[PDB]
Amino acid sequence: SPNPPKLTKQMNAIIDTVINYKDSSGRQLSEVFIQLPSRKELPEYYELIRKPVDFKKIKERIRNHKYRSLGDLEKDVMLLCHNAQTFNLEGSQIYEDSIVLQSVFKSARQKIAK
Amino acid sequence: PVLRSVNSREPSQVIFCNRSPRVVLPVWLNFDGEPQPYPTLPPGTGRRIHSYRGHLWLFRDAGTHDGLLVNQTELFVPSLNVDGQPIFANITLPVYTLKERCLQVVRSLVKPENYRRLDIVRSLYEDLEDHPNVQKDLERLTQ
Amino acid sequence: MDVFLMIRRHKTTIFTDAKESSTVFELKRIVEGILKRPPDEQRLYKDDQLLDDGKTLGECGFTSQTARPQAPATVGLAFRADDTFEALCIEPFSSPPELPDVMK
Amino acid sequence: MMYVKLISSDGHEFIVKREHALTSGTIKAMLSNEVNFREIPSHVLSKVCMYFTYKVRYTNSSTEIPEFPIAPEIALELLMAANFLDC
């Protein structure tokens, strides 16, 4: 299970860039995706989607050493963005926020690589 | 944009009350200033909704998109609850001008393609085609 | 509770407002102030029933739920020409044109 | 309370309050006692007078505002009157 510290160095640096994007106006776009909605608040979300995720769980995956490469971590971030775009309708705030966090992560994966 | 919600992150309980014969459609102005629809309110119904402080709201008709006043004003924003007391939003009909009210009745009876086949003056066809719009009123609301 | 009504006679139609508690005599005093004819020279009606001076508008059947601003209740009015009172006559309004085929 | 006489095309005389008739911008310009309309019929002008009593009553009324009913048979003629009257 223990993974190389230099890979873990980057795996947290990609997510921290995604977590801390203020978008000039001073609004953290990635603050709603930190913790999943409570299952007792509205079950319709858990009924509509097949696999739930959130950045608290993605941060814990580095601590548990689940992700073995950048491709495994990218699989879950695109799946999280897909869950947002599936439940939320086109034109809403969360739909456009996940579209911004999708691009911010693609540029962050490249910057970290080279 | 000047008209947008403020990301306060402090809960604010609100009571949306529909005191009009129309199917009210609550519309929320998001953090980028764009409007967003929410579940409609049938005539003469009230529900206790969970909102946040400094969040801008405006209410229109579900079908015709005609403007509706709240607490005798165009738009509303709930502030923090004093001692956990709900904020009330009494949605009412504005006292429409007889011209604007007459347009709405003809708009519901006649189809958009058959506006210019009516026996009326040239200036009234352009006024009938000028439907109620959210973005139009948001540009007008700024000052 | 306010009562919005239209006191009608031949072609003259007075639009005014009164209270449910106010008397029929007080409504004749309002017509006295507009058309300049004393109360003893007037006869008010609800449909085809002669209203007494002492009775209130609420007692005559003019409730505020029916008599509203957007749809005022029609009240008949007949004047006296010296000796006897004239017969109640109200000229109806002009009929609208037939609904166009496009509007159906 | 001051009153004003509004005459229709077919000769129907409608007595309304001065304040009520000022709702219309066109009538406000004509007055500033008796006003005659050659293009507006009685069934339309009575509906315009019903709107004047409706507006003045429910303006600044925070209670609740009922909707002004317009039947499909007079919606076209009452629209042309409202545009000419500016109300």
Side-chain angles (χ1 to χ4, degrees), chain B residues 80-85 87:
Chain B
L80 258 176
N81 301 119
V82 171
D83 298 309
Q85 48 197 246
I87 308 291

Side-chain angles (χ1 to χ4, degrees), chain A residues 96-114:
Chain A
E96 296 298 329
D97 288 5
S98 75
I99 277 177
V100 167
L101 297 172
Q102 184 157 22
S103 76
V104 171
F105 172 57
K106 309 230 203 210
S107 78
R109 219 199 110 161
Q110 291 176 342
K111 157 62 192 272
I112 269 51
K114 280 173 316 305

Side-chain angles (χ1 to χ4, degrees), chain B residues 64-85:
Chain B
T64 65
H65 279 76
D66 285 287
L68 277 121
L69 297 170
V70 266
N71 299 338
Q72 298 289 278
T73 179
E74 301 272 18
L75 33 68
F76 145 89
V77 38
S79 35
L80 258 176
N81 301 119
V82 171
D83 298 309
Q85 48 197 246

Side-chain angles (χ1 to χ4, degrees), chain B residues 19-22 69 72 90 92-106 109 118-121 123-124 127-128, chain D residues 47-48 51 54-55 58-72 74-76 78-83 86-87:
Chain B
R19 306 305 287 182
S20 63
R22 313 289 198 109
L69 297 170
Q72 298 289 278
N90 190 70
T92 50
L93 261 183
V95 187
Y96 296 126
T97 44
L98 188 59
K99 179 179 171 65
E100 184 55 45
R101 175 52 189 161
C102 283
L103 295 173
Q104 290 163 21
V105 191
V106 177
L109 294 155
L118 302 168
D119 187 36
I120 53 178
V121 306
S123 58
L124 286 172
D127 297 344
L128 256 111
Chain D
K47 262 280 171 128
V48 164
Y51 177 75
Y54 168 88
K55 178 126 182 161
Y58 293 116
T59 15
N60 256 18
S61 181
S62 59
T63 314
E64 155 168 12
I65 289 128
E67 183 153 47
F68 192 71
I70 311 206
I74 93 286
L76 256 155
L78 190 60
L79 175 51
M80 290 193 282
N83 177 208
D86 187 35
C87 68

Side-chain angles (χ1 to χ4, degrees), chain A residues 64-77:
Chain A
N64 256 98
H65 310 89
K66 191 283 221 316
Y67 301 133
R68 296 280 317 286
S69 72
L70 279 49
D72 298 358
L73 162 137
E74 171 149 297
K75 208 91 234 219
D76 274 44
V77 171

Side-chain angles (χ1 to χ4, degrees), chain A residues 15-34 55 93-94 97 100-101, chain B residues 7 9 31:
Chain A
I15 283 303
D16 287 321
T17 305
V18 164
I19 299 250
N20 306 318
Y21 186 44
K22 294 246 116 184
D23 198 32
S24 86
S25 313
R27 185 165 87 77
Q28 190 173 313
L29 293 154
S30 41
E31 81 204 333
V32 0
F33 313 98
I34 287 236
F55 299 160
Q93 193 63 91
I94 285 15
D97 288 5
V100 167
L101 297 172
Chain B
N7 188 41
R9 315 195 83 251
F31 311 113

